[PDB]
Structure formats: C-alpha cells, structure tokens
Structure 1
Amino acid sequence: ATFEIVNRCSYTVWAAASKGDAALDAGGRQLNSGESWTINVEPGTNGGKIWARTDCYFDDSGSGICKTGDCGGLLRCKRFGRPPTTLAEFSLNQYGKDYIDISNIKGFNVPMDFSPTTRGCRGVRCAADIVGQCPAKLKAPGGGCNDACTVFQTSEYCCTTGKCGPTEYSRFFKRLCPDAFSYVLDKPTTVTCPGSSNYRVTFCPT
C-alpha cells in the first residue's frame, strides 16, 4: 500500500514510520516545508504508525536527536518515538478490511490529517492548536503537549488495569480534537476502509 506523507507546515519535520519492532519502508526522512515523500507499507501490516519529529539534528551516519518524537536517535526509525507525538495509526488487510485512526494518547506535537486516496471511506483530522492551548501542567519544555500518562504515571491515566475513565486532561484533548483518541478506553474513532486502500498523511493541513 502507498502512503504519501506531505509536510504543509512552515517548518521542517522529520517523518517517521514504524510498526514498533521494525521500520516501515526506510523508517524516516527529512521533509522541508512543502515536500512530499511516498512510502510503501507491506500488506497485512498490523499496528503501524506514522508521526512527525521536530527540531532534529543528524550526523552523516544517520545518528542524532530530535526534541519531539525521537526514535532512539536514528534518522531511519526502527522503533516508536518519544512523546509528545500526534499519531497516525493503522492496521491493513485484517480479514478483508483496513482500519485507521488518529491518537493523542501519546500527546500532540504537530497537527495532522490522515485520509484515504482511494474510494470507500472517510479521513480523520486533528488540526486544532493543541500546543498553544495546552494546560500548564502538560506543556513539555522540549516542545509539544504531553499526555497525562507520560506526565503523572498513574494507573488511571495509563489505563494500566484496562479499567479507567475520562479525566480533566483527556477531556482537553477530546474538546480540541473530537475525532482522535484522547485516552485508552475512549469511544473509538477508528474508520473502516476497504482492504488494500492507499493513504495520505498531511502535517499542518489547515
């Protein structure tokens, strides 16, 4: 399946793509303002994610650091990124269908739209100014708006036991972005698409 990743932000981002234990395609690449990078994701990929990283430096071997979304200091991500990270999430060819969503469970760094480029289903978007409106206690000094599990490490925010409810913090993310997951047990905003659809992830869509 193809995913076109487009940076409409005014600043450079380093895109990343991983399924947690391996890179998807090359795993990461720099996108200057306006640039597009198309990756190929194997059919059947379960639990894949795409995100933006900000304020990165990499040496000529591909090793360095980013202030949001860093994946073990690699340009070409093999693992998931360090919060805060707005997440485009997907599982492909699961009993004939694809499933997509956007999640704020690991915080928010960059606004995003995640839409199919083929027929049969709708896209989802979280493009509100979550960083600007972020509650004081969730602001990350390194940049972005952390989720409450990252900040406070409680069973209630991290849903450790699989029993948890909404919180003042989760309701902030849900108010600004109703169509994204705000906590682990949120009422799902997953979209079902035809199996083998293709997609576009756009950073700073508005």
Structure 2
Amino acid sequence: ATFEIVNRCSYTVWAAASKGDAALDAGGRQLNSGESWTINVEPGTNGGKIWARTDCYFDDSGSGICKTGDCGGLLRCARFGRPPTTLAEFSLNQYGKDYIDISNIKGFNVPMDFSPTTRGCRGVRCAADIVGQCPAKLKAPGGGCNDACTVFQTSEYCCTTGKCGPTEYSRFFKRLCPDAFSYVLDKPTTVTCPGSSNYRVTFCPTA
C-alpha cells in the first residue's frame, strides 16, 4: 500500500512511520514545508502508525533528537515516538478490510488529515488548534499537548485495568477533535476501508 505523506505546515517536520518493532519503509524522513514523501507499507501491516516530529536535529549518521515524537534518537524510526504525537493509525488487510483512525491518546503535536486516495471510505481529520488551547497542566514545555496518561500516570487516564471512563482531559481533546480517539475506551472513530486501499497523510491540512 502506498501512503503519500504531505507536509502543508509552514515549518519543517520529520515524518515517521513504524509498526513499533520495525520501520515502515525507511521509517522517517525530513519534510520541508510543502514536500511530499511517498512510502510503501507492506500489505497486512497491523498496528502501523505515522506521525510528525518537530524541532529535530540529526548528525550525518542519522542520530539526534526531536522535541516531539522522538523515536530513540533516530531519523529512521524503528519504534514508536515519544509523546506528544498526533497519530495516524492503521491496520491493513485484516480479513479483507483496512482500518484507519486518528488518535490523541498519546497527545497532540501537529494537526493532520488521514484520508484514502482510493474509493470506498472516507477520511478523518484532527486540525483544531489543540496546542494553542491545551489545558495548562497538559502543555508540553518541549512543544505540544500531552495526554493525561503521560502527565499523571494513573490507572484512570492510562486505562490500565481496562476499565476507565472519559475525563476532563479526554473531553478537551474530544471537544476539539471529535473524530479522533481521546482515550482508550472512547467510542471508536475507526473507519473501515476496502482492503488494500491507498492513503494520504497531510500535516497542517488547513494552514
């Protein structure tokens, strides 16, 4: 499956793509404002994610740091990124269908649209100004809006027991972005797409 990753932000981002125990494609790349990077994701990929990283530095070997979304200090991510990270999440070719969503469970850094480029389903978007409106207690000094699990490490926010409800913090994310997951047991906003669809992830889709 192809994923075209487009940076419409006015700032550079370092895109990342991983399934947690391996890179997807090259796993990461710089995207200056307006640039597009097309990756190939193996059919059947379960639990893949794409995200943006901000304010990165990398040496000539591909080692460094990012303020949001850092994946073990690598340009080429093989692991998931450090919160806060807006997440484009997907599982492909699962009993004949693909499943996509956007999640704020690991916080928010960059607005994104995640849409199919082929027929048969619809896209999802989280493009509100979550960083600007972020509750004071969730603001990440390094940039972004942390989720409450990251900040407070409670069973309730982290849904550790498999029992949890919505919270004031989850409701903030949900109010700004109804079409993204706000906590683990949120009413699902997953979209079912035809198996083997192709996609576009756009950072800063509206500005």
Do both share a fold (TM > 0.5)? yes
What is the DSSP-based 3-state SS (H/G/I as helix, E as strand, rest coil) of the residue aligned with 2:38? strand
CA distance in 2, matches of 1:19, 1:118: 22
Q: Give the CA deviation at 1:83.
A: 0.1
Alpha-carbon deviations, 1:113-153, whole Å to 9, x = none? 00000000000000000000000000000000000000000
Q: Give the CA deviation at 1:178.
A: 0.2
* Aligned-residue identity in percent: 100
Q: Give the CA deviation at 1:21.
A: 0.1
Q: Give the CA deviation at 1:199.
A: 0.1
Alpha-carbon deviations, 1:68-113, whole Å to 9, x = none? 0000000000000000000000000000000000000000000000
Q: Give the CA deviation at 1:197.
A: 0.2
User: Unaligned 5+ residue runs, structure 2?
Assistant: none
Q: Give the CA deviation at 1:194.
A: 0.2
TM-score by length of 2: 0.99
Q: Give the CA deviation at 1:48.
A: 0.1
CA distance in 2, matches of 1:120, 1:39: 21
CA distance in 2, matches of 1:4, 1:40: 9
User: Unaligned 5+ residue runs, structure 1?
Assistant: none
Question: Are 2:43 and 1:72 aligned?
Answer: no
CA distance in 2, matches of 1:163, 1:108: 23
CA distance in 2, matches of 1:126, 1:186: 15
Alignment of 1:1-206 (within 5 A): 1-206=1-206
RMSD value over aligned CA atoms?
0.2
Could you list the structure 1 runs, at least 4 aligned residues long, displaced by more than 3 angstroms after superposition.
none
* Pairs aligned (count): 206
Q: Give the CA deviation at 1:57.
A: 0.3
Q: Give the CA deviation at 1:17.
A: 0.1
CA distance in 1, matches of 2:98, 2:109: 26
